[PDB]
Amino acid sequence: DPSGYNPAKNNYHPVEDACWKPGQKVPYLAVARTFEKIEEVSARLRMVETLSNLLRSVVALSPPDLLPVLYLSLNHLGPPQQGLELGVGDGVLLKAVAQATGRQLESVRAEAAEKGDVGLVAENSRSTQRLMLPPPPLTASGVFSKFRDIARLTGSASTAKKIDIIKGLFVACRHSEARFIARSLSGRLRLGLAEQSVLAALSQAVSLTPPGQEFPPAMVDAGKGKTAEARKTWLEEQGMILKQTFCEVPDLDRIIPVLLEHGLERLPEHCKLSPGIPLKPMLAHPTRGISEVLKRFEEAAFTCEYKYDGQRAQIHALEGGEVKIFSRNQEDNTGKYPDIISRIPKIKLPSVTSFILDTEAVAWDREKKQIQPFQVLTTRKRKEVDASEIQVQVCLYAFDLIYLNGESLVREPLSRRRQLLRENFVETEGEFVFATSLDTKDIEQIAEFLEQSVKDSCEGLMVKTLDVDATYEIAKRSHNWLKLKKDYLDGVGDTLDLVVIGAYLGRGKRAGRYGGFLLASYDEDSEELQAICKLGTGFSDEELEEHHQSLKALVLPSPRPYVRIDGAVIPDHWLDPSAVWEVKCADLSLSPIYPAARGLVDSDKGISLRFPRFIRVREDKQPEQATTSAQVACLYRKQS
Amino acid sequence: MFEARLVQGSILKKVLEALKDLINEACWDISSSGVNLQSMDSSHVSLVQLTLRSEGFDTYRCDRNLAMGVNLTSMSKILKCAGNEDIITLRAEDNADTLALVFEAPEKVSDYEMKLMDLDVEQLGIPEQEYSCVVKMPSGEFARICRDLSHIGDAVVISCAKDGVKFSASGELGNGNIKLSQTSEEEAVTIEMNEPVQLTFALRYLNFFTKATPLSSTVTLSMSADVPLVVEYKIADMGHLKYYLAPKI
Amino acid sequence: MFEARLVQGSILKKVLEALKDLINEACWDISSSGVNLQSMDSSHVSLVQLTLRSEGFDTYRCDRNLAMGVNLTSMSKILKCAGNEDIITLRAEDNADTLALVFEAPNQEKVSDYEMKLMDLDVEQLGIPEQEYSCVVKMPSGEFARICRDLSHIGDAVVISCAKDGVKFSASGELGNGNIKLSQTSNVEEEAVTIEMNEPVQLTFALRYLNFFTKATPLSSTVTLSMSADVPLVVEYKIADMGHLKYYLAPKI
Amino acid sequence: MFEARLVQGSILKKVLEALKDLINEACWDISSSGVNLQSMDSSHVSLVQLTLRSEGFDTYRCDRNLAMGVNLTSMSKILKCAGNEDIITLRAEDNADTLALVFEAPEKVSDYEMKLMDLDVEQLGIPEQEYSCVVKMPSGEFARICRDLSHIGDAVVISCAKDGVKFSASGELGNGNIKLSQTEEEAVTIEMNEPVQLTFALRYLNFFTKATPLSSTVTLSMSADVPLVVEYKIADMGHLKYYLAPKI
DNA sequence: GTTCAGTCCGACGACGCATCAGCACAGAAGC
DNA sequence: GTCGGACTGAAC
DNA sequence: GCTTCTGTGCTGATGCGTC
Ligand SMILES: *OP(=O)(O)OC[C@H]1O[C@@H](n2cnc3c(N)ncnc32)[C@H](O)[C@@H]1O
């Protein structure tokens, strides 16, 4: 009986402490119990221990059931490059719950709002619609198979077929599996553990109880007789091995069978980087300015480059003559850029058969020979590969090289990689360039390069080591490079003061409290508040409670006549406009959703803040003395 | 090799349209008794029975009892091809993973092969039991009742008394009810009553059932405590459809 | 304690379906003389007037004058569950939050009863005494419907020019413009066009409301329009031995 | 100038109904022989031709050979205004961008004026061919079989022999066929020179069939390597043909 | 050895293509 | 995209 | 004529993928 299953016991045992027969399909109840235990614990190590405990039993008892258990734990449906999506939002699943409970929608809507979690509303109420066959127990293989079925059934009236499958899952629930299934569907599984931690749990399990042993296996603890420190040293070295082995091939479907069949030490001998298999991109830490750059890099050579304000593109060229592109997140971008597919033979040297490149693509002004803002880039059509009628011209901007001709280059110092990059490629201005790069260690030189960057439409500077700690491997550190954004390197960016007129009730950490706020600018020539943005970030938890209690008494049953809102979502309560908040922003964009400054720059397209960050309440001002539409228009004109 | 022929292929069209929106996959059992289906719904809330009696066919011949799985979507898109006047042949080769049909118009012949599928059979043997109410009514009026009730509420309370049946429901508008009385043939209302009974049902399922109305102008509803509701359509000398709906509370 | 019994319930169907889209809600005055309503539309451009004369009910029982607030979309769904040949009863308790609707089959077999929750409304009414309008037309309903359904494609507005010999409707738009002429006619009463008119008018209106106004067309095979300078057009359907319905639409520019 | 009258204006309604969905923009070429149009579709796979004989008009004056550029979708939007019973008058100026339609029912007059446009027209000369298989068959039968086969598979194989034509569809759902055998307006006739098999994509034939209410009979013309010809015989007025390039 | 330092995990945001739904009407077919 | 928050190691 | 339906978009409404 899995309802008594306790992996959090001391002295955990792989088969003795299990709750089903050998060879059997794993009861989904056990996975839900484990998620229940994981929610009970705040200690990350203890959570990874408990997950490794379950994983160890799974590979001991029912080897094929492994992959579903991982993808369940990953809240994912397969390889990210396969493009699978569940495609079911809050509204559809909410209706599914109302029908499974037999309730009307509005009570359960307000209930899920107040607890800010679909989980706890998924149990409780019951349809009383007594089935003629009580359902079989849920199995983790069956549940994952239903989630890929849900993803697959598109077309007209598809919502009916979704509602029917999800129904069967809900009515089949046994103890408390409903909460975890509902959170699992809604993306917000809130389990408090992700990719790096699950791979840790995998390494720990597959180390202690490796695969391929005949049941019952005679060995259970590879750590037996080792000191707890030297145990941990063995665990962690297998950690780095596996994590890098994951980052070179970010897909369990490739890794897991070969792992089960050959053992984790021989695993790399079968797995190598190649185009046609994606890789994780490179990461960077935020830094405020030059001192921290000089301190972090105090004994390493480095260079300075622009951060062009585009999007990343991962370029695969195969000797077979097709090319593939992936986004920053391994999503399969081929179909977005069939023109770039055509540009490949004029970008490479012909002496190169295959490559993997990391590059930024940015929209370009072909006649003005200059960059345009990112709100032009996001206008591209998505799926179909009709290169014929290109409305948005695009230029490529190289910054790093990953693979060439057969040699993988990831183990290599950046200096050599940039050397080979320049030496084995050709440029074409406004079609393909290398990123503007400047090699230095000194202050006012960087200040001059920054001033050129901001006036040449770039988010800041990129700072990277040339050789020391200048290999690509994400496992040592993911965030090796630095970004020097204008936002605080200016000392102060575009900071504004705006009027709060409404709140959004929060969920998860934000549950019970407000999670976001609605802001307006004071339009004096109408004397009205016009909506400008929401806020959802940059404030701590104690000051969160301070804002919540301060706001709670000022809620109103109606929107005031001195408030203009349109397209912006209705606040979860209406709030009297008496408070003004100081905030920074990254950029200003023409909004189709925000009435502020309508007709001051264009009659119909409004404006809004990209990336608003809370600072502090500006409690000394009255609301009418906050930022007015005139300064908003001046600021946006001063952006250009 | 199994072969069956009917002049009234319109029956087959009406039948599959009566099945369509309820289930997507089913395995059909064929015997010397004829063609028979059991299938629970993918929600496990309601079940269909099919009977086609072999003697109802103009031509029928069987070597073996067959259980073939069929995707109801594609095969109904195929059955759309038949005109209302067409003579249908169904043929199955015993080990085929495809099913052969011919449509014959009263110099033109339509020929089809549809791929089969392999299915993990769920079937429930319904016990024969008596029911505290049996009602014989016109299909068309039942259709109006159910379609009407669809707007007003989501669940129905069905009440029976010797004086006449009563259907009631409610929603975010108020309450709706119908009291329907007996007559004094194809237009008639008649009852086989045993005791005054009240049960609850989910109208979305009855609206799915109603699609069979063009099969027979009159129908049996059979209702008893603590058991599924039976709706049965007797297709004329050909067989029947039965639908079992589990109750609420 | 009101009762109305009506034999021809399809009348109520056809009148109610003309408002369900125009206005989501309404208020209904009941009095000894009959049933009355005046409402503004949702965008507050046009006005609807409704009169059902008590004489036309098969049975009557106005024990009080009442003003029910009613969601027309809900009542529309409800009567979309009413039979055409059915004989309709409305019953209202004075003290209730409900209107009872009960229906009896011609075969006496099928009895329907539904009850609808009432509510209050913030009634705005405007006084519109009769005026001796400068133009009056009677003409075939299906004709005008077809004309509006045509010309709304061409351009968003129509200009109507009347002279004693006949009327011309003009619409102008991006592909071009179109002018339809109608003459007065005689010796076809029901299919004829009649004009009583005092001076040649030329006025402009937005067809996005005209396509709404046409939705009554099955009520009366003839329609009247009336024009006057600097005032709303009136459009009226005569409810057969029962009442009338009128639209008032204010002039553009 | 140009000045025409047609009593059976429903013909021209059905004509413009046929074209609007396939080709959006076109050129009207006018002559003493009547009205003629050739045009190539937006995918450039299929060509249409309309022939209207001037003698079929109830009244007809052509002073010059015009070439008028017209948005067919907007033209159809105008033509929806007439009832099928309406008598139609067409009136053209020489320099004008603008064409007058006068509609009259059997006591009402519609005056409509359409602005023209300046267009790149692609021309294909079509010399005579004799087609190896010529099928004359009742139109609705073809239309319904097309709408059927659209589900079985996006492509068709057509077959002819002197004893009958067979139309086969093929896809993951299954494969299917219709046989037809040679048998007044209910009859099917074939003239066959050489037995044929051809492969085609259905999307276009689905479009062609919208002309069906123009004619009780349709004629199929087939020969090796050439586009399929489908023809709608307008009674005494002229003809309407579609050419479709066979696949690969 | 603890005041720092970096990991890692989930809070929230602004756009926009896709992408499907929900009346609502012409249309044809059946009566 | 971005900022805070809980946790194990960092190294002066 | 009316029926119920079917195929018809037209315009709206969020899910999901970027930063
Ligand atoms: O702000 P962020 O954390 O998302 O930044 C990382 C992204 O910055 C883009 N970018 C632009 N230019 C470069 C260069 N020169 N080097 C590295 N990254 C660069 C990328 O899109 C990256 O994901």
Numbering used by the authors:
A (entry chain A): 262 to 901
B (entry chain B): 1 to 106, 109 to 186, 191 to 255
C (entry chain D): 1 to 188, 191 to 255
D (entry chain C): 1 to 106, 109 to 185, 191 to 255
Which sentences from the paper describe this structure?
During lagging strand synthesis, DNA Ligase 1 (Lig1) cooperates with the sliding clamp PCNA to seal the nicks between Okazaki fragments generated by Pol δ and Flap endonuclease 1 (FEN1). Lig1 comprises an unstructured N-terminal region (residues 1–262) and three folded domains (DNA binding domain, DBD; Adenylation domain, AdD; and OB-fold domain, OBD). We present several cryo-EM structures combined with functional assays, showing that human Lig1 recruits PCNA to nicked DNA using two PCNA-interacting motifs (PIPs) located at its disordered N-terminus (PIPN-term) and DNA binding domain (PIPDBD). Once Lig1 and PCNA assemble as two-stack rings encircling DNA, PIPN-term is released from PCNA and only PIPDBD is required for ligation to facilitate the substrate handoff from FEN1.
We reconstituted the Lig1−DNA−PCNA complex by mixing full-length human Lig1 with a non-ligatable nicked DNA substrate bearing a dideoxy nucleotide at the upstream end of the nick, and PCNA in the presence of Mg2+. 3D classification yielded a main class that was refined to ~4.6 Å resolution, and further improved with Phenix Density Modification20. Lig1 and PCNA form a two-stack ring structure with approximate dimensions of 115 Å X 93 Å X 90 Å. Lig1 is suspended above the front face of the PCNA ring, with the DNA running across the ligase and through the PCNA ring hole. The DNA substrate is embraced by the DBD, AdD, and OBD at the nick, with the duplex segment upstream of the nick encircled by the PCNA ring. The disordered N-terminal region of Lig1 where the primary binding site to PCNA has been previously mapped (PIPN-term)10,11,14 is invisible in the cryo-EM map, suggesting that PIPN-term does not participate in the interaction with PCNA once the ternary complex with DNA has formed. The structure, therefore, represents the product of the second step of the ligation reaction, right before the joining of the nick ends.
